[PDB]
């Protein structure tokens, strides 16, 4: 089944738009307690939750497909992950759905030093390349973290001890308020050019960002909930994904919420208002489509909200979020690559490239090098809009030794339905909006990854929200 | 109210049996027919219920206790949780986090650990005469060492030979550990560590195990290592940074409550099972009294160290039945102390091997304004805490000979627990690798389920609710609706 987003590219068929995924649902549609909007983590956890709990549910989403901003497309074999990727045991909420479906055995390694060139390649200017072993990346890395992160002495452990609740410690506040250049500026004399320029690639690839637009504080919140180490870092970020793709653990929720008997879903529905009514609450499609259920859950995404007709009218903080908007415009482009050896390698260009970091991802079945490249607002690329250019931009991360046989890309920025990619914050803007973004609306709860305590902006995060928001309605209605 | 499990000592009351709980339940009984019964109130049993009930089924829960919690639950006492057993938990730790979280307790947690103020030390003892004090730093930096030529088997501190700790044989190098001793480890490194290193390094694989360094297992060490971010700060912030201010009991509650509160939930405390046997159509438990219970789905969460006293029908696998019969090896003594020495909030201590209590650590401050310590022995040098109080301050006070008096003791002495048999899961070498799948095998409509068998976090309250949602789970897929 194809899907009407995403876009891929090889020699023979140039640029095309559309992938295949599991995450298509057909029929779009099979026709209430409850109205679910959007089908990704948090909708499809809520709607899961409420349907078991035996709650007659509706969910409208606006996309063909569930899965949101995480989905994956296989092609020749090989599944492509177009947004949302890798998860840890240490994300509580990802992985006890993990678990419970069983897929707790079903994850692949994403990197493999075993065999090929086995190199970190930097490059901080168009003209050269700086190669080391990844145990020489590894103490890099480490060295430069080191430096930003510890504004207590601990790495963050003092100021930031539990990190779902950011207020413990009054002087995080502070951090939260501080951009990446403001850190960065207070370190500047003890950072080699490397040091830095792996840092910035390094948090900047976390941000989407740029350093003056991306919090500080944010930063050490990931870095807290990874265990306050790069090693937990990268355990918890880029270590382990699904062999079959996200798109089939998204199918797991749907099928569950599906053998309820009480769901009912449209697709191809993008909702246009959300207004509450005397112990109900309507919600009108773009198309005029009118649905009524007595409680909603809104899980539309931060940068995408300020489309949507409330009325009640939302409070002040929701709208300065909203109007401000996260800052992770990450452009994420996979490249199967005619290197072997390749595998093995990973790689930094920075600030020079379009695409700031990548790494050997996987290797397809017909024996090519699959690599994940990464690029932020800093020096931002749109893939779609000029493949030549892209495909430079992907060259770049390791001149003259590769030819590129197929890009897969989706573009987030652009897309209509999210306006960005993964939460990542403005400074203050957490600490200044988080609970207003948490915080009741009559008969609509308000759900998102954006949002969570905890793995905020991840998966977990959507699932965390997910679980919160059917706990919320069906207390309400008992 | 006041259960009958539990002791407290004081000078003026000496000892008394049975402290007060949350998890007591009154009235004892409620009460088909029954879609499922669920043996056992701990955190498996309880996850399985409130799964089981919310999804619509019926659900009759037997409890040989008067309580709830199984393994895990606190008294208070004068204000303060004292916790009898399963204490601490984690955002690494992903079943009991999502609780925590769903049921909005993810800010009711408190810090064990507190150097602000005190001695602020740790005292090292390795023979009855003297003791060795150094600073909170010297002593992470000793263990880091010490744990880290332990655990280096493969050049990554497990990470190679273990890098998917929920599938053990994902690497065939695993095995050879799980099937070695903590003995024939520390063999292998025994030139290499200092008397301090040895002496630290054995206090803290023991006290993990609750049982000798010759019948633990490297392995499932290794297992905990790996799961808590193979560092040792990664086991200290998994293991022993955070509990519940309110008790362990006050979250057993939150289950309770959700299961109550659908309307479909029948229970019997003070209910000991006797027999479990397969019909044609259903499942028939028996209690010890002769009672009948009758239902479509078991859920047996009663743990490995007490499966050998039930009588099962048809007859249990051979693995399953070799794992109960040589049982787990965890027979920790844990034992708390109220203390008159204000400054050593900030204490920490391991008394090694000649103290029949090793590990212990300042944990909180009673509303009384008195220094809460816990304390904890292992089988290598074992104490029953309830078979002479005397012997029991002793071992307590010879932690920090001369230092303190105590005020007050409170513990459970899970090992002679008929309804525990031991403490926590520990296996002995080999005993994982042969006997995990047995343990988790279906038995017609019987679902085996417990912290004990768990793939994860196997021996935590985490593994608990782990097997209580693979238990609901398999019970709402066999039987529909
Ligand atoms: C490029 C990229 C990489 C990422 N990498 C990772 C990673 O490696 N690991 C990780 O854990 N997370 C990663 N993330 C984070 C990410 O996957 C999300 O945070 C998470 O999936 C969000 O879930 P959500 O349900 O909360 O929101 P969404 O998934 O965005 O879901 C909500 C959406 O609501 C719908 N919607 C929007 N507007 C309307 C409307 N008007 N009417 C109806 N429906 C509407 C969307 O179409 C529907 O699917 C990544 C994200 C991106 C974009
Ligand atoms: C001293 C100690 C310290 C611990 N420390 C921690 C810690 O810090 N953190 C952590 O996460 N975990 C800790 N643990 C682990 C521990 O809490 C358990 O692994 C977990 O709580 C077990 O849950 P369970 O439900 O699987 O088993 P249990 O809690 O044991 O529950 C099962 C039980 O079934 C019942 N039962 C037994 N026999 C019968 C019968 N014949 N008929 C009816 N019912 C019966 C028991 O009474 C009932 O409660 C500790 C345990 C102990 C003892
Ligand atoms: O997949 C992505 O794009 C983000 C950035 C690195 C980790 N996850
Ligand atoms: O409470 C206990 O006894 C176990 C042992 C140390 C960590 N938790």
Not at 272 to 282: F, I, K, L, Q, W
Request: aromatic content about 12%; hydrophobic content about 35%.
């Amino acid at each position: 089944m194809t899907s009407r987003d995403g876009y891929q590219w090889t020699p023979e068929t140039g640029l095309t738009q559309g992938v295949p995924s599991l995450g298509v649902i057909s029929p779009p549609t099979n026709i209430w307690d409850v109205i679910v909007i959007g089908g990704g983590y948090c909708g499809l956890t809520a709607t899961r939750d409420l349907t078991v709990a035996g709650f007659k549910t509706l969910l409208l989403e606006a996309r063909d497909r569930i899965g949101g901003r995480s989905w994956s497309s296989n092609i020749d074999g090989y599944p492509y992950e177009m947004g949302g990727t890798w998860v840890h045991w240490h994300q509580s909420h990802v992985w006890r759905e993990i678990t419970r479906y069983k897929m707790h055995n079903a994850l692949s390694p994403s990197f493999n030093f075993s065999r090929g060139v086995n190199h970190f390649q930097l490059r901080t200017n168009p003209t050269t390349s700086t190669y080391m072993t990844h145990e020489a990346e590894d103490e890099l890395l480490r060295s430069a973290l080191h430096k930003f992160t510890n504004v207590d002495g601990t790495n963050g452990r003092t100021v930031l001890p539990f990190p779902h609740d950011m207020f413990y410690v009054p002087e995080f506040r502070k951090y939260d308020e501080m951009s990446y250049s403001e850190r960065i500026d207070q370190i500047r004399d003890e950072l080699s050019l490397n040091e830095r320029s792996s840092l910035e690639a390094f948090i900047l690839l976390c941000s989407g960002g740029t350093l003056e637009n991306s919090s500080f504080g944010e930063f050490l919140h990931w870095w807290a909930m990874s265990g306050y180490t790069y090693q937990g870092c990268m355990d918890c970020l880029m270590s382990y994904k699904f062999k079959d793709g996200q798109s089939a653990f998204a199918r797991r929720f749907w099928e569950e919420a599906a053998g309820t008997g009480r769901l009912g879903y449209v697709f191809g529905c993008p909702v246009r208002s959300v207004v509450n009514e005397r112990d109900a609450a309507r919600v009108t499609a773009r198309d005029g489509r009118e649905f009524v259920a007595k409680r909603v859950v809104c899980t539309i995404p931060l940068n995408v909200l300020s489309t949507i007709q409330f009325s009640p009218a939302l409070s002040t903080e929701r709208i300065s979020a909203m109007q401000a908007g996260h800052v992770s415009m990450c452009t994420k482009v996979h490249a199967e690559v005619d290197n072997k050896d390749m595998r093995s390698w990973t790689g930094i260009a920075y600030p020079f490239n379009k695409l700031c970091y990548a790494i050997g991802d996987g290797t397809t079945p017909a024996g090519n090098t699959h690599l994940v490249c990464f690029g932020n607002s800093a020096n931002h690329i749109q893939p779609d809009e000029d493949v030549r250019e892209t495909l430079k931009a992907v060259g770049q991360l390791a001149p003259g030794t590769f030819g590129v046989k197929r890009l897969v890309f989706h573009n987030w920025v652009k897309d209509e339905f999210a306006k960005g990619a993964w939460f990542f914050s403005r400074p203050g803007m957490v600490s200044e909006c988080l609970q207003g973004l948490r915080e009741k609306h009559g008969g609509v709860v308000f759900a998102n990854s954006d949002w969570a305590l905890g793995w905020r902006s991840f998966i977990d995060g959507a699932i965390e929200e997910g679980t919160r928001a059917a706990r919320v309605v069906l207390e309400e209605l008992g």
